[PDB]
């Protein structure tokens, strides 16, 4: 098969900068090379076909060039909505093959998270379980540290966290961490605290409540 190698794996560039994405084929594919954009939760969308031809309704700021084994996708001015994975694809030969993709991230200014904590519901407690949720809202960059503490004891192993895909409008991330304990453990302790470390914060932010 024809292997298509994409570089870089990740491009982080400021809004408005020029983005240049590379795709290298193992063997000449001639001009039979296409480019796709995939946004979170969406099917891929054709940007470029026949190496340099723009699909219907595709913004002029997207362009492709190349023949044989070297190919480039260019975004003339990155827009916040341009957060996606970009894939190249050949059909010079069966089987049809794809690159492994380039993620283009939008590098915006630092934004501190807004921190929020949530107690478990009475309904869940009746079921024998207690989940506490901590939310870090609208921050940049993606790197953030959440520590859960129950009566000063750092909780490790009993939480799960999830991070949203980069926001298409404001270029921020959000993060949700769920600390899950038995009802019996939850009732035995008093202070429930979420401690957040992020570069946009001058020092760590703690949100806490007392079960009482």
């Amino acid at each position: 098969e024809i292997v298509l190698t994409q570089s870089p794996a990740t491009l982080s560039l400021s809004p408005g900068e020029r983005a240049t994405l590379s795709c290298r084929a193992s063997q000449s594919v001639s001009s039979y090379l296409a480019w796709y954009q995939q946004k979170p939760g969406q099917a891929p969308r054709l940007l470029i076909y026949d190496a340099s031809n723009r699909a219907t309704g595709i913004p002029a700021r997207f362009s492709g060039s190349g023949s044989g084994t070297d190919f480039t996708l260019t975004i003339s001015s990155l827009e916040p909505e341009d957060f996606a994975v970009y894939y190249c694809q050949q059909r010079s030969n069966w089987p049809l093959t794809f690159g492994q993709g380039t993620k283009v991230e939008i590098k915006r200014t630092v934004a501190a998270p807004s921190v929020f904590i949530f107690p478990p519901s009475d309904e869940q407690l009746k079921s024998g379980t207690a989940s506490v949720v901590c939310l870090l809202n609208n921050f940049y960059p993606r790197e953030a540290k959440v520590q859960w503490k129950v009566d000063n004891a750092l909780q490790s192993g009993n939480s799960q966290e999830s991070v949203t895909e980069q926001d298409s409008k404001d270029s921020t991330y959000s993060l949700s961490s769920t600390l899950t304990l038995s009802k019996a453990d939850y009732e035995k302790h008093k202070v429930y605290a979420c401690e957040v470390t992020h570069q946009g914060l001058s020092s760590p932010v703690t949100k806490s409540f007392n079960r009482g």
């Binding site: 492994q100 929020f116 409540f209």
Partner: protein, 220 residues
Amino acid sequence: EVQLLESGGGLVQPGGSLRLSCAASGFTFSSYAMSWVRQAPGKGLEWVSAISGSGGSTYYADSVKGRFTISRDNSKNTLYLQMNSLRAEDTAVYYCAKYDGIYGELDFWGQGTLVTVSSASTKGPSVFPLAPSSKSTSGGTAALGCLVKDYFPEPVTVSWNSGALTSGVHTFPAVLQSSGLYSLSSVVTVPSSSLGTQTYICNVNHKPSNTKVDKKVEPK
């Protein structure tokens, strides 16, 4: 305008089988070669199969040869993919896509249908409130949400106030827990002054399990 509408994806046993469907409209179906392409959770794109306009010619990736059969019914404008001998590694969103016979690209894609190959049981979520309080309020902005807990398979959908509320919403990617069950949360930030005056309801749907919940989230 072109549409490709997919169906038939869901949870199946390893060794089991499924048929995916793709209903095409807005263009002359028989004039075009078609393709199935798939995407595993957190991974890239993998071509699966392709069929000529008429159906007489078919092609397959080696990872699916002898198990999957692509076929079409031109009189119904429908594409099919029969999937037999399924494996955990066949777990993916499968896309239907139109093929450009001149230039070799897939010029139009359906939104996809999720196939989960697992021996784990279907289970509906429990929905718990993430209640607004002074501990989730910062200067005229309050956060509130819903914890959609302990379900299988994916996906669940979450709207707010039957879709009337979209600004400031963050519905998070589901996480697979050590129990083998997923959990997700959905949150929204609203004006603190609205907490006494506006109702906030998260509408959860887990179609795999026939579980619908509307959860009103009240101040704590």
